[PDB]
Amino acid sequence: GCPXEPWC
């Protein structure tokens, strides 16, 4: 579920 959010 990466990318898409800054928490990877």
**DSSP secondary structure string, 1-8?**
--SSSTT-
Categorise residue 5: left if φ over 0, alpha if ψ from -120 to 50, beta otherwise.
beta
Elucidation technique: NMR
Q: Which residue reads 């898409």 in tokens? A: 4
Residue 2 C-alpha from the chain's centroid: 4
| Residues sharing a CB contact under 8 Å with residue 8, sequence separation 6 or more, in sequence order | 2
Q: Is 7 exposed, middle or buried (0-12, 13-18, 19+ CB in 10 A)?
A: exposed
Residue 4 C-alpha from the chain's centroid: 4
